[PDB]
Design a protein around this nucleic acid. Structure first.
Lengths: 108, 129, 150, 52, 150
RNA sequence: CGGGACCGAGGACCGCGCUCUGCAAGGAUGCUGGCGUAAUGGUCACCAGCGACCCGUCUUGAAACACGGACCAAGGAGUCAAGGUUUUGCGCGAGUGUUUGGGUGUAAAACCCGCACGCGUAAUGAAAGUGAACGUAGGUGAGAGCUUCGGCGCAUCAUCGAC
RNA sequence: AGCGAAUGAACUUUAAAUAUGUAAGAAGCCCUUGUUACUUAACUGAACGUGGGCAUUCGAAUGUAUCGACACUAGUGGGCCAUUUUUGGUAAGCAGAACUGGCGAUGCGGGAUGAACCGAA
């Protein structure tokens, strides 16, 4: 608005290589850390899994459906076996998943 | 005298070499040593410009540098304050720990019998003759 | 009431004591040198224009910021040197009991919580100086005149 | 609401100092000196005073 | 003229919120009354934090509350003058009583699911009018892109 | 103990007190006269005493110099857009953004809808690539507030560690 | 000042005026313990840490609406005059620096009058 301006008050006083034809879709690979891995589970099934109402079933998570290609290992995981299907994985993330009791499966 | 970093020193340029001194401001100044050389020393001096202090650094030969006694009185006073406080706690009597400014003199009487005053003129008559 | 009676008696006795000591020395053939003054009243009589920074700072520390302002100063060397430096702006001297009581009775204002409150009651002096034993204006006058511990 | 001079108003004097009435009645500002014949000044004081 | 080398300083802190929230104005009135009529410094601090802006009131997460609830602070009432946000990296939530300006829906749902309770600041003033048994928490003030770019 | 000038702020009581039937003690009341209207007061024109360079701009440190101004009416000069940044208010909150579009409509309004996408949620390297818990997410010194009074210690700061 | 003290501004028992540097506490003072990659003939000093002792007065005066850290914004940043100090000069003028004060930004009383004078803002 013009009426709030200061000029109304001042009225009367005046490296590296070059990549030709780059395609970002080649290097598209979004990543998620393992402390947000349980957030991809739907909330109510996540609550039964965390409470301990499912002693005979394990969840399978597909990261490509949620929009992620690499599973990274920031944070910690509970002692629940989780099957993870990811395009990429880091070594310590896979170690923490196996310590939790699940398995990391590679998909394309 | 082997000077060390952090020692507080006084600067006195001895001799009548004042014909061509570049900086006579630091003569008689006190500063802190930051660098030591075999015949030189680095002195931090503070100058006052109006309301603020500016920091200057000089290189002075050892022949014009003497150790300062600025904190000698403070360390000494700390020592007898501790010792007389221990003595006061031993004997159970209060004692003064604070130095005080000079107080005005009290009333007193001056005898005249052997000290008769001499009358003086604005000039001496022995000088008049 | 009793304390004011004691103070009046003490003033009379100290005056007669000084007179008696002077007379005794004169009769014995000597001179009694009186004690140097312990209290100085200082009045700023020159303005705030064209003043060097050191006298400016000394007048600030002596609380003489306006012309015709007066303060009481206990005589030490540390204050005597300051007053000697700010001599070209002040007039100072040794006040007597009448000067002290006139100043405190007529122009007596206390600093209470950073405010300038007139001394209209003994109560203000009592809650502002009762921890030092000064409970009324007569104690205040006695302390200022005799230069007590407070 | 109004600062009153205790040296002009006797009531303010009596409020600030209850001994003022006793001072005025007993006339302690008019006390005479102690009795007794004063001894004279010694002579040597006078020759010292008038010595050129 | 009077010589004032120093200058009287106007207040450099907020005395009233810039917000036009009527419920916030009611909360300010309530805590002004509380800070005037009680000796507890908690009421004055809560009034000052009600005065502050949003960048001076960073959000506090459930993980931060669960961190501060440890070591004998389990039964204390958590007071946060800010928005309490949910943190999904915290998989299990301890039982807690939290009084805040506002809660996110997920944070309130997770607290009530874990078995704790959520309060407004007026409910806090009614249950703990002197701020007894309270744990006062702030969020990370310097965790902002502007603060990083400073 | 007289003589004179200026002032009367507040508006039940509270207080300090005193000479204690009351009071000169936290701010003026009592008695009386004339008039009840241009009498007090106000505006305009003029005279009298005292005071008082013509405005704006430029310059430098400043004046001076210089430039503009015959008079009056109307017009007349830091605005809009895009992109940033800091602060303020608001909504939601690890999410957020309906309005490219579709549905609908009392039809350029209002209301509704969702896929993608932008920003944020992970950085580093020229790149290939790799990718953030030894510990109640560490130890120490402060630190508002709370406390069962032993301590717990927000934000933040300093420092030593860890990834 | 004395040299009825020694010796002879360069003599000193003692000691100027003027402003001026440094320091004046628990955030500090030491002691002890060890290491040293410093240094020292050297476990010797010092630094680095460790532990302990010192709160019986917190260790001069005066003053203290005087705190600190950010964020954003603006003008001016090799101007004039004067006191003092100092370096040079000229036939005489004058020219450099350092501090302070005033002015440019300032009204008022007095210097008959006024950028630089006095009082006072």
């Amino acid at each position: 608005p013009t009426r709030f301006s200061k000029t109304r008050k001042h009225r009367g006083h005046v490296v590296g290589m070059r990549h030709f034809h780059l395609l970002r879709n080649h290097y598209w690979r979004p990543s998620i850390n393992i402390d947000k891995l349980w957030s991809l589970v739907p909330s109510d099934v996540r609550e039964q899994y965390l409470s301990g109402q499912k002693k005979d079933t394990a969840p399978v998570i597909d990261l490509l459906s949620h929009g992620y290609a690499k599973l990274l290992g920031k944070g910690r995981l509970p002692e629940i076996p989780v099957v993870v299907r990811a395009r990429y994985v880091s070594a310590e993330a896979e170690r923490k998943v196996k310590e939790a009791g699940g398995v990391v499966e590679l998909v394309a | 005298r082997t000077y060390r970093v952090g020692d507080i020193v006084d600067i006195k340029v001895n001799g009548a070499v004042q014909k061509g001194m570049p900086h006579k401001f630091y003569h008689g100044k006190t500063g802190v040593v930051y660098n030591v050389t075999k015949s030189a020393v680095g002195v931090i001096v503070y100058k006052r410009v109006k309301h603020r202090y500016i920091e200057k650094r000089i290189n002075v030969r050892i022949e014009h540098v003497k150790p300062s006694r600025s904190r000698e009185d403070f360390l000494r006073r700390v020592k007898e304050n501790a010792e007389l406080k221990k003595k006061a706690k031993a004997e159970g009597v209060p004692v003064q720990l604070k130095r005080q400014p000079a107080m005005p003199r009290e009333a007193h009487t001056v005898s005249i019998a052997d000290n008769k005053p001499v009358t003086l003129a604005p000039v001496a008559y022995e000088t008049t003759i | 009431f009793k304390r004011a009676e004691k103070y009046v008696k003490e003033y009379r006795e100290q005056e007669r004591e000084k007179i008696r000591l002077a007379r005794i020395a004169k009769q014995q053939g000597s001179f009694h040198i009186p004690a140097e003054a312990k209290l100085v009243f200082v009045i700023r009589i020159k303005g705030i224009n064209k003043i060097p920074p050191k006298p400016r700072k000394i007048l600030q520390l002596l609380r003489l910021r306006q012309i015709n302002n007066g303060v009481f100063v206990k005589v030490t060397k540390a204050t005597a040197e300051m007053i000697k430096i700010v001599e070209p702006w002040v007039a100072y001297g040794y006040p007597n009991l009448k000067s002290v009581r006139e100043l405190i009775y007529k122009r007596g204002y206390g600093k209470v919580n950073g405010q300038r409150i007139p001394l209209t009651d003994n109560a203000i002096i009592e809650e502002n100086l009762g921890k030092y034993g000064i409970i009324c204006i007569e104690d205040l006058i006695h302390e200022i005149f005799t230069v007590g511990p407070n | 609401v109004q600062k009153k001079n205790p040296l002009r108003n006797k009531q303010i004097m009596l409020r600030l100092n209850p001994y003022a009435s006793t001072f005025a009645k007993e006339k302690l500002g008019e006390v005479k000196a102690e009795e007794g014949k004063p001894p004279k000044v010694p002579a040597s004081f006078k020759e010292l005073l008038h010595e050129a | 003229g009077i010589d004032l080398r120093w200058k009287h300083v106007r207040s450099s802190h907020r005395k009233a919120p810039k917000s036009d929230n009527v419920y916030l104005k009611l909360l300010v009135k309530l805590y002004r009354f509380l800070a005037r009529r009680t000796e507890a410094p908690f009421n004055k601090v809560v009034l000052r934090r009600l005065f502050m802006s949003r960048i001076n009131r960073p959000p506090v997460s459930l993980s931060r509350i669960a961190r501060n609830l440890k070591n004998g602070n389990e039964k204390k009432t958590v007071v946060v003058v800010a928005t309490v946000t949910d943190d999904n990296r915290l998989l299990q939530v301890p039982k807690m009583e939290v009084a805040a300006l506002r809660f996110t829906a997920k944070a309130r749902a997770r607290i009530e699911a874990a078995g704790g309770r959520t309060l407004t600041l007026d409910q806090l003033a009614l249950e703990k009018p002197t701020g007894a048994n309270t744990l006062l928490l702030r969020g990370p003030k310097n965790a902002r892109e502007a603060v990083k770019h400073f």
